[PDB]
């Protein structure tokens, strides 16, 4: 299972370039992950967090990327916010879980870290699962970049600190499930 291999890959993709991944033929060893007291936000939807290990699904896609520390509050199915209209619109039929935690102490350096970006100007609201990498000039008339450098700092508070997030998404279609079999 390339799970923490996705998580502890030292660099991530951005919130607009959110990297889903194909997961199949695996054990359902989620329990040691939420017994590992290192993650912070534990919000599962459709299936109970302890019940994700028992019941198995198809179409596993983990969306791992970096967002702000106060904007995990804006992470919910159908919550309309700055993350929903421009970065990525979350689905209302979302069956899965979202997990975030801080690792700012290695993300931060003495100077302003200008490597990743975030979509502060997009043209109109997204659908579920939309990836628009169209980084064109913004007609707002007054014409700025559609992305901006994340101004973060170690002096910035934890709500203004970067979090590593993962969104496990499941879709039940006509196929046998390929995740459960562990803890049997």
């Amino acid at each position: 299972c390339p799970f923490g291999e996705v998580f502890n890959a030292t660099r991530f993709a951005s919130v607009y370039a959110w990297n889903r991944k194909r997961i199949s033929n695996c054990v359902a060893d989620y329990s040691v992950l939420y017994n590992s007291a290192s993650f912070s936000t534990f919000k599962c939807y459709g299936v109970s967090p302890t019940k994700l290990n028992d019941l198995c699904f198809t179409n596993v896609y983990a969306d791992s990327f970096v967002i702000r520390g106060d904007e995990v509050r804006q992470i919910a199915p159908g919550q309309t916010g700055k993350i929903a209209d421009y970065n990525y619109k979350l689905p209302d039929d979302f069956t899965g879980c979202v997990i975030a935690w801080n690792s700012n102490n290695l993300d931060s350096k003495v100077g302003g870290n200008y490597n990743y970006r975030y979509r502060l100007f997009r043209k109109s609201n997204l659908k579920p699962f939309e990836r628009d990498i169209s980084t064109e000039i913004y007609q707002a008339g007054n014409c700025y970049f559609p992305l901006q450098s994340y101004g973060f700092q170690p002096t910035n508070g934890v709500g203004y600190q970067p979090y590593r997030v993962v969104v496990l998404s499941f879709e039940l279609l006509h196929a046998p499930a390929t995740v459960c079999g562990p803890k049997k």
Epitope: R22, N59, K123, S124, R131, S134
Partner: antibody, heavy 121, light 110 residues
């Protein structure tokens, strides 16, 4: 009229260089991704790449990286597709593509009209 | 060519409603919204449908689309002789970072 204009019917020799052109007119040129589209005759629709003309930002097919050479200039309002080496697999009708990025969706509403590059033997 | 399964040949009387079904991997149709295209023979292609139901400038109201997750359907009601063209279930996706294309849907009248 928004149009990505490719030139007339193109003939050269293989192995050499050719920079085919695609004028962007009737619209704000560098505000849409311009997609270079391939069509070898008798096949399902083929793809080469798509390029933003600002700093030549590149989203291309990973199985032709470095073979096909792209450029797109704002002041010339022209996307340029170059091959430093031509072959028999290049012989195809090529199209351009203007993505309808106007506070709308993606899809490519305006196309290139089609230009066949050939070698005659 | 990409993994976007499309019927290459359809037919029907003038006035019929064809249904072009398309499916594949969830990174193709389930992730990004399915778009639809149409190319007349020896001409340029043309966009029909974006964002699973929305049309660009210059296409009629017969062309309608739907997306059911990774599945998709083009509905074209009231056929005429304009339907001598191959249709594409095709979208800009980040499966292999491309505007991934379909296998054509060319129709003739009989």
């Amino acid at each position: 009229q928004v149009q990505l204009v490719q030139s007339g019917a193109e003939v050269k020799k293989p192995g050499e260089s050719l920079k085919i052109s695609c004028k962007g007119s009737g619209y704000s040129f560098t505000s849409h991704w311009i997609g270079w589209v391939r069509q070898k005759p008798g096949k399902g629709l083929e793809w080469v790449g798509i390029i933003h003309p600002y700093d030549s930002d590149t989203r291309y097919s990973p199985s032709f990286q470095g073979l096909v050479t792209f450029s797109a200039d704002k002041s010339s309002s022209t996307a340029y597709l170059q091959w430093s080496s031509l072959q028999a697999s290049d012989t195809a009708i090529y199209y351009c593509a203007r993505r309808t990025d106007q506070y709308g969706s993606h899809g490519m509403d305006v196309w290139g009209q089609g230009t066949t590059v050939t070698v005659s033997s | 060519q990409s993994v976007l399964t499309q019927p290459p040949s359809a037919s029907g009387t003038p006035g019929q409603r064809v249904t072009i079904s398309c499916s594949g991997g969830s990174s193709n149709i389930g992730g990004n919204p399915v778009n639809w295209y149409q190319q007349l023979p020896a001409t340029a292609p043309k966009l029909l449908i974006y964002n699973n139901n929305q049309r660009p400038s210059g296409v009629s109201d017969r062309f309608s689309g739907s997306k059911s997750g990774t599945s998709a359907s083009l509905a074209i009601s009231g056929l005429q002789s304009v339907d001598e063209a191959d249709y594409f279930c095709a979208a800009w996706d980040d499966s292999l970072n491309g505007v991934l294309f379909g296998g054509g849907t060319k129709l003739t009248v009989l």
